[PDB]
Structure formats: C-alpha cells, structure tokens
Design a protein around this nucleic acid. Structure first.
Ligand SMILES: [Mg+2]
Ligand SMILES: [Mg+2]
Ligand SMILES: [Mg+2]
Ligand SMILES: [Mg+2]
Ligand SMILES: [Mg+2]
Ligand SMILES: [Mg+2]
Ligand SMILES: [Mg+2]
Ligand SMILES: [Mg+2]
Ligand SMILES: [Mg+2]
Ligand SMILES: [Mg+2]
Ligand SMILES: [Mg+2]
Ligand SMILES: [Mg+2]
Ligand SMILES: [Mg+2]
Ligand SMILES: [Mg+2]
Ligand SMILES: [Mg+2]
Ligand SMILES: [Mg+2]
Ligand SMILES: [Mg+2]
Ligand SMILES: [Mg+2]
Ligand SMILES: [Mg+2]
Ligand SMILES: [Mg+2]
Ligand SMILES: [Mg+2]
Ligand SMILES: [Mg+2]
Ligand SMILES: [Mg+2]
Ligand SMILES: [Mg+2]
Ligand SMILES: [Mg+2]
Ligand SMILES: [Mg+2]
Ligand SMILES: [Mg+2]
Ligand SMILES: [Mg+2]
Ligand SMILES: [Mg+2]
Ligand SMILES: [Mg+2]
Lengths: 71, 116, 206, 86, 96, 23, 137
RNA sequence: AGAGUUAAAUUAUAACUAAGCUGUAAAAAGCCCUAGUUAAAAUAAAAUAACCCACGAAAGUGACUCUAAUAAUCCUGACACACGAUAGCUAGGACCCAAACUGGGAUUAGAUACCCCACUAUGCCUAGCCCUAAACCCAAAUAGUUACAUAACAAAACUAUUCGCCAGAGUACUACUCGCAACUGCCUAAAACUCAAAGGACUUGGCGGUGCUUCACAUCCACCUAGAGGAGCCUGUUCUA
C-alpha cells in the first residue's frame, strides 16, 4: 500500500461524502485495513487527495466495495 | 459477517479490560420480537394548503376553484381506503420475511440449548 | 338488536329488479344473494318504494322530530315545502321573462342545492398535546358534512327565530337565504373556515 | 469551505422529479450514517454515554446478525411437513 | 456428546464414526436380554418420538404382539400410572 | 439494596460538610 | 438512456445545458432548514442575491413557523419572486436537517420553478466546537 | 515527552439582500451592532475508519509528520521510592464554543429545580501543588487443573507459594493523635450511648405518570340525543332545635 497513489486509496471511500468504509464493506485482513486507513489519512493531511468528496477524475474505477447505493 | 466476540466479555480468563457490557446475557431466546406498528403521520397536507390558497386568495367562495376541493375529497377518500386496506395487507404479508407466529413455531421446533 | 348478524338491509328500489337482463355482474350478485339462503330484515316504517319520497327529506324530517311526534315533523316539513313553493310562485309572478326563466320553483332541488352549498368542507377536532387542547383541521366524512349542515339549519331556525314567526316559514326563509348563499348558516360555515385557516399550522399534529 | 463546491453529497434529478432524488440522497446519508450523526450532535454526549451507547449498539448488532443467521439457516424448514398424522 | 467418546472409533472429516465392534458387543447382550424378558412373559414397550418412522415402529409392535408409544408421552404416565391408565395396572417390564 | 448504605453515607457526608461550613 | 447521478464537472467537456446556459451558470437556492425556522434564498451564479423569503416573512409566528406548511408557503413565495426576476432552473442546496426539508423542496417545485440538482451541505464538525448540553438532567 | 503542521466546522471583521433572528409541548424574555450568502486569521476539539481490541504498570491514549522510547535470562513483597481521571489552589498567557454561580423569562400553591436566554470561575498552554473517584471488571500477584462438585444471583468449580485485609449494626469517609507546599483538605482511625438485629440473594402477589401489541362499543376521546346543577313544589339526608 502507499499514500502516493490516490486511486487505490480512493476506491475504499464513499463518493458522495468521503467517508472510509469499514471491514464489513471493504473485506480485508485487519493489517491491510489498518494500512489503508493510515495511508488515506496521511494522504488527507499531506494534501494529495480530497476530503469532502471522491476525486471525480477517478470516479469510474471498478467497484471493489459491496455497498449498493441505488435501489 | 458477525463481529468478533473474543476478549469482549468480563471473565476470569480474560487478561485485557472488558469491552462490551451487556445488560442482559447474550442468549438467543426461542422467540423473536413482534413487529413495530408504524407511527401515523398527517395526510392531504399539500391539497389542504392549496385549498387554503384559494380560500385566502378568493375570500372563501367555493365557486371560484372547485378542482382542488375535488382533489382534497379524492385525497381524503384515498387515505380512508388506504388505511382500510393497508392494515389488513400489512398484517399477513411480510414480503421476503415470515410472520412472527410461524417464526416462534420454527424456533420452538429448533430451540437453543444453554443447558447441558 | 333483535336482528342477528346474518340479517341484511333490504333493497327497496324497484328499477333495480325491473330491468335485470342488461348487465351480468349485478345479476351474479343477486343470485348469490338469494342462493346463499340469507335472511333479510323487515322493511323500515319510514322507507318505502314510493317515487315521491326522498332520503335527505326523510333524514331532515327525522331531525325535525322532537320526542316521538312523526306526524308533527312531517306536517312542519309539508308546510315548509308549501311555503317554499308558494314564495317561489309569488316571486315568479312578479318578474319579467328573463327572471322567470332564471327562477327555479322546485322545492326539492332548492333544498338539495341549499344543503350542497350549506355543508362545510373541512372540520376541526380537539387534540391534547403538552397539557393543552388544540383545534386541528380534519377532512370530514360526507355524512358528517351533511349532518353538520342539517344540524346548523335546525339550530339557527330553532334559536334565533322570534316567538311570533312560525317555524316552517322561518325555515323556508332560511332555505332561500342558503340557496342565494347569503345565509347566517353560510356565514357560520365561513367562520369555521376562518378558524380552520387560523389553525392551518396545527394540521401536522394529526 | 476550501473544497470545490457541488461535488459532494449531490444527486441529480431524472426526467423532472425531485422526490426520488431526495430519497436517493437520504439513502446515501443513511448508509453513510450521517443522519444519526446530525441527530446525536444536536446536543453533547459525555464519553461515558458514548461508550455505553457503542457497547449497546455492538451487542444489539451481534445479537441481530446472529439471529438473522439463524433465520436464514432455518428458512428451508418452513415447508409443509410430509409426515402429518403419522 | 461427552459420554460417546469411548463408544466412538474416531472422526472422519468432522463426522463421528461409531465403533460397530462395540455396537455388536452391546447388541448381542441387548437382543439376548430382550429375548429372555420376552421368554419370561414380560411387557415390552417400544418408544421412538420421531415422526419419520413412527408408523413403522407401530406396525413393528403390532406384528410383535408387544406395545408401542411413539406418540406424545404424557408426563405422569410411567410414574403416576394408576391415575392415567386404570385402577390396577401392571407396569411395563422393558422399554426399547 | 446497597443504595440504602450509599444514601446513608451520602447524608452523613452532606451533614458533615454543612457542619464544616457553618462552624 | 445512460444517466449519471454525478454532476457535470466544470473541467470536463460534458455537454448538458438547461435553457441555454451551462451548469455553473444556473442560480442557487440555499435552504437553511432549522428545527424552528426555514430560510430560503435564491442567489445568482455570481453569488448576487436574487430573492429571499422565510417562514417568519410569510406571516407565520413562533410555533407556526417550525411546521412544514410554513416552509411550503415560503418555497411557493420564493419561487414566485424568483420567477418575477426571471429564472427557470435552479440548483438547490440544503443546510441542516429540519421538518421543512421535503416541504421546502416541493414548495420550490410547485411555486413555478424547476430544480435539476440537490446538494446536502449540512455543517458536520469533525469533533470541532462543543455543542450545548443535553436536556432532562 | 518534546518540536512542527491543519481538513470538517465555528468566529472576530467586511460586501450584497431581507425585516425579522433565537427559543420550545406551548409561550415569554433576549437580540433587532439581527438573519442568509460569499471571503476569512486566532483559540478549542480531533466525523467516518472503529462491526477494530492494540499500547501503557495504573490513571489513560485512536487528526498528521519527525525525534527519543516502552525495566527485569521475567516469583511474592511494604508504612520506602515514583506516578495517579476529573474537580480544586498561586503566578503568567489564551478565550471559538460549552458552562458551576448569578441575573432575567416560563412552570408551580411555593421552584432560590427539571424548560429557554446571556455571562463568570473553569474546561486550553507553560511552571509548581493538591493525591481524591462506583480509581469497579466491586473478582490480588505468580505457577497450574477440568479431577470432586451445582446455597441463590452473577463472570463455571478449583489446587500450590505469598502479601494486604475481615471479629454484629448505627454512632463513623466521625471526635482526639502522627505526618503532608494540603489550614472548609488528605491519610491513619476509636469510644461513650442505643438496638436485637443490621445485612446479601431469591419465591409469589400487589403496584407502576416504564415499554410494546390487541382493545373499550353507551365507553375513554373524537362524536349523537335527552337531562341535572339556575326557578317553584314534593321527598330523603346533613346541620342547628
Ligand atoms: Mg494490559
Ligand atoms: Mg445489569
Ligand atoms: Mg477554516
Ligand atoms: Mg445519619
Ligand atoms: Mg449557553
Ligand atoms: Mg446526574
Ligand atoms: Mg507539552
Ligand atoms: Mg419578545
Ligand atoms: Mg480572537
Ligand atoms: Mg478526527
Ligand atoms: Mg517489559
Ligand atoms: Mg515485586
Ligand atoms: Mg491528580
Ligand atoms: Mg486544572
Ligand atoms: Mg471564560
Ligand atoms: Mg431566576
Ligand atoms: Mg475507570
Ligand atoms: Mg474498594
Ligand atoms: Mg499483590
Ligand atoms: Mg431454583
Ligand atoms: Mg461496634
Ligand atoms: Mg472521601
Ligand atoms: Mg477526617
Ligand atoms: Mg485518639
Ligand atoms: Mg356513558
Ligand atoms: Mg325536565
Ligand atoms: Mg337543569
Ligand atoms: Mg333545581
Ligand atoms: Mg329540600
Ligand atoms: Mg335519620
């Protein structure tokens, strides 16, 4: 994992709000869940990725999360 | 996936501090809870508002605009028919779920064993 | 209730029976009706298959009656319709051609149009919330609207009439005022509408 | 404030109706949990109350998901019994 | 169950395997005891509260000439026998 | 239960604090 | 008919117009929906205020202005004043959670105004200022 | 423990628009140097992740980065030594927001309370104290067992080596001593006198302005009719006689 790649960190983030998904949506080992959380928050503070929204240039990435927003 | 239960409760063998403090013990009973009745809310509000809009605009004469009065009466009749049929239809139909009486019979057929 | 739950209300209208062969579903309904071997109540003493009766007239006469004097209430309704008819005839004879074409002389349609302009549209209920009673507007049932119209008519013509003016001529005068939409019952309905719009903001308490 | 406007928490209407987009927006905030956050941030809750609420919510979630797992396990036994009057 | 470990041969991929050497050694004595209690003119009752074979237990006992209770066992039946069954009732001598 | 003992100790401590404040 | 929920990005070359103007040219309806009041303001794309209304301005009073019907009348009147200045489409943004949210949106709909997008910009602190204490001590 | 940094809010202060804003079950008081939108320092606090269960001896710690760093080749052990949540004290600074006290406005027979508005100490940093908690997970530390075995409830029952405690209840987290930057304080801690109980866990009723379902059919509301309570008389009581 890394804090320099915005796309990988931003796949695990809600597009409308910017929240970070938990284990029940993401589905990782706890080690990688903690590394994704720390890598996102480091990118949030250091100025590489947006806070309030998903960066819209990476909006059409493949969906790894299991949350369904449209019903 | 069920949240993990290791090291949560207060036991003698637990070295860490307790995390979860249940009020009642975590035991599945042989019955499920009853469904909650939906709290009612006000109906025909928009039709009532445009009805009052004609009344204040035209000084309380029914002969000016009768369409909203017919729509308000239709709204009242629709609400009466809806509260007539929805109470019957929501008692039996549980969509993809099962009625609680048959759930209680199923869990009485297959009970949980805290003992032996 | 000397009638059991199996007993139903009778059907009185002759034209429902006299032309059955033009439609299928109401036929199937009444062979279900007399093939379930279902008990029918006796016909009520007020309702009859006469074509000169009318049900809102019957209900209004039932509300006219005080105590148990049916014949007195029917006499008051008879002189009321007589006064309405003869007042409209006297208004007809004193007018020109366009006003004679305008004027309707049928007291039955005058009574029906008077109650149709007389019934209130919306009503008020008291609801207790936070230890206080608040008036909240509600849509009313049609029987309740017609009942409120009838009760307001009887209430006005019983209360603010004079002792010398007679009851049927007074109710005839109020029928013509409600027909021309200038009556004090129409003003009372408008005042109820004033209170309903003044309490419009409380309508979410229902 | 410092971010770009009208990108976050934004839905667009389809074919001229706004109520459907409004329920869509409310579902987004509901699965994101922001609605209960605004309800709980109207007043201040002490950390003791926060810990008690989180413990109660975790206990209820564990019990409800395990009970729903038991219902999904026993759903295939809701058929009519073949041995009636045996 | 914790009392079945001496009677279990082992576990095959999570499934318990019962030692039929021990089953045959028990079953010879069980059948011999049943034969002797039927020889000495005793009352023999077959009980199986299971609604998949209950007709087959009941027909089995009908052909045996012995008695069966595969239905609901009432609470005070074997214990409070004179109130449930009759004024003087001879209790069953053996139950399978 | 134990709330009786707790309330008795509470009342004693409150009365002692009022005694200290008055004297 | 592929429709996307997400807005037409200003940096993108997306081609959607409403009555001839681009997406960021369309005026804005700020809807502050509180628990006791609902204040509605339509402002231009250059953030010049076009019209303003509130439940107190619509002749309601204190407990009356907290209900939804006051917010509905405020939406109708604000859309009327927006139509008087001559705007057809508006992008609506809602601040705060209140009982008059639905009523304000449908009042802006029924008052002779068209909406194309709704943005919920509610102040969510990341544990910032401490709010007031809870009731019923 | 230091040093550096700020994303979401919020605010001082400006520019346009409006006459209202806040406040609740409902109202008043307050503010109209007000409210909404757009720009924004300083201070305070660190959504989601967290359905995670880690670090520290405990208190405690979950915004980011860096530095230093988490004893014991690991038994028990004090009145010795070193820490010890919040609240509180002296001096300096900071003060968005919250708020004891206080002043107003509601409620009430009264309300120096629960509800609303404003503000102070205080909550923050530096430096020194104070050494108190339902400091509780009411379950001591270190090695082990599932043998015997269910007072009750709760977190199942127990072996070995130690340490601190426990001798009826009230009096009593008290009086008087020793010690302490504490002087309305903390620790240690009785007696005179009174009683035959003080207690812990349960069983069943009763009750509940506690919660959830189904109801009331002249019965509670919504709602219908006729009356009483106002007048005269009859008649029965209560008071005087
Ligand atoms: Mg530890
Ligand atoms: Mg408990
Ligand atoms: Mg800022
Ligand atoms: Mg005492
Ligand atoms: Mg305050
Ligand atoms: Mg308290
Ligand atoms: Mg420091
Ligand atoms: Mg005032
Ligand atoms: Mg400042
Ligand atoms: Mg944070
Ligand atoms: Mg170590
Ligand atoms: Mg040691
Ligand atoms: Mg301290
Ligand atoms: Mg301090
Ligand atoms: Mg201050
Ligand atoms: Mg006061
Ligand atoms: Mg603690
Ligand atoms: Mg202790
Ligand atoms: Mg020890
Ligand atoms: Mg027992
Ligand atoms: Mg003693
Ligand atoms: Mg103390
Ligand atoms: Mg002392
Ligand atoms: Mg002494
Ligand atoms: Mg009654
Ligand atoms: Mg009388
Ligand atoms: Mg009377
Ligand atoms: Mg009297
Ligand atoms: Mg008398
Ligand atoms: Mg007497």
């Amino acid at each position: 994992v890394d804090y320099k790649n915005v796309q990988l960190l931003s796949q695990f983030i809600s597009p409308f709000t910017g929240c970070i998904y938990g284990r029940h949506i993401t589905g990782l080992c706890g080690k990688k869940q903690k590394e994704i959380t720390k890598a996102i928050k480091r990118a949030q503070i250091l100025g590489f990725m947006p806070v309030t929204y998903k960066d819209p240039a990476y909006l059409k990435d493949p969906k790894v999360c299991n949350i369904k927003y449209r019903e | 996936a069920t949240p993990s239960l290791r090291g949560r409760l207060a036991r003698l063998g637990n070295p860490r501090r307790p995390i979860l403090k249940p009020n009642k013990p975590l035991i599945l009973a042989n019955h499920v809870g009853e469904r909650r009745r939906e709290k009612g809310e006000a109906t025909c509000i928009t039709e009532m508002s445009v009805m009052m809009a004609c009344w204040k605009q035209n000084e309380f004469r029914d002969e000016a605009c009768r369409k909203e009065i017919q729509d308000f009466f239709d709204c009242a009749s629709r609400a009466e028919a809806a509260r007539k049929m929805r109470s019957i239809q929501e008692n039996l139909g549980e969509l993809g779920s099962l009625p609680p009486k048959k759930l209680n019979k199923l869990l009485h057929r297959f009970p949980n064993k805290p003992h032996v | 209730s000397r009638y059991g739950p199996e007993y139903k209300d009778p059907q009185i209208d002759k034209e429902y029976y006299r032309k059955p062969l033009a439609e299928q579903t109401e036929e199937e309904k009444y062979e279900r009706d007399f093939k379930k071997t279902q008990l029918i109540k006796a016909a009520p003493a007020t309702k009859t298959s006469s074509v000169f009766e009318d049900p809102v007239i019957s209900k209004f006469t039932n509300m006219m009656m005080k105590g148990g004097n049916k014949v007195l209430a029917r006499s008051l309704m008879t002189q009321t319709l007589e006064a309405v008819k003869r007042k409209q005839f006297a208004k007809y004879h004193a007018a020109s051609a366009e006003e004679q074409a305008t004027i309707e002389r049928n007291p039955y349609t005058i009574f029906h149009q008077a109650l149709k302009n007389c019934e209130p549209v919306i009503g008020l209920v008291p609801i207790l919330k936070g230890g206080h009673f608040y008036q909240v507007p509600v849509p009313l049932a049609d029987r309740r609207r017609r009942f409120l119209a009838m009760k307001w008519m009887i209430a006005e013509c019983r209360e603010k009439k004079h002792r010398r003016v007679l009851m049927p001529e007074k109710l005839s005068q109020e029928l013509l005022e409600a027909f021309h939409n200038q009556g004090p019952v129409i003003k009372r309905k408008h005042d109820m509408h004033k209170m309903a719009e003044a309490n419009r903001a409380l309508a979410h308490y229902r | 404030a410092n971010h770009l406007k009208f990108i976050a928490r934004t839905v667009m209407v389809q074919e001229g109706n706004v109520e459907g987009a409004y329920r869509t927006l409310n579902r987004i905030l509901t699965m994101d949990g922001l609605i209960e956050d605004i309800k709980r941030r109207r007043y201040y809750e002490k950390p003791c109350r926060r810990r008690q609420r989180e413990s109660y919510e975790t206990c209820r979630r564990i019990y409800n998901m395990e009970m729903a797992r038991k219902i999904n396990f026993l759903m295939r036994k809701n058929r009519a019994d073949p041995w009636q009057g045996c | 169950h914790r009392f079945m470990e001496p009677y279990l041969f082992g576990s095959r991929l999570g499934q318990d395997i019962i030692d039929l050497e021990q089953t045959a050694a028990h079953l010879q004595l069980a059948l011999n005891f049943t034969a002797h209690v039927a020889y000495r003119e005793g009352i023999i009752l077959f009980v199986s509260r299971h609604r998949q074979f209950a007709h087959l237990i009941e027909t089995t006992a009908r052909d045996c000439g012995e008695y069966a209770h595969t239905r609901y066992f009432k609470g005070g039946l074997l214990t409070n026998a004179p109130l449930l069954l009759g004024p003087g009732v001879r209790l069953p001598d053996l139950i399978i | 239960k134990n709330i009786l003992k707790i309330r008795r100790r509470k009342m004693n401590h409150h009365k002692y604090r009022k005694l200290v404040k008055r004297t | 008919s592929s429709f996307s929920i997400y807005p037409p990005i200003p940096g993108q070359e997306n081609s959607l117009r409403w009555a001839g103007k681009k997406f960021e040219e369309i005026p804005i309806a700020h809807i502050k929906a509180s628990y006791n009041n609902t204040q509605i303001q339509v402002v231009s794309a250059a953030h010049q205020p076009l019209a303003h209304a509130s439940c107190g301005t619509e002749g309601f009073r204190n407990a009356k202005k907290g209900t939804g019907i006051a917010a509905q009348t405020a939406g109708i009147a604000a859309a009327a004043k927006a139509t008087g200045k001559g705007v057809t489409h508006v992008r609506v943004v809602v601040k705060g959670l209140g009982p008059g949210r639905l009523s304000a949106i449908k009042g802006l709909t029924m008052g002779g105004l068209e909406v194309i997008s709704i943005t919920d910009n509610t102040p969510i602190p990341h544990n910032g200022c401490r709010p007031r204490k809870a009731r019923r001590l």
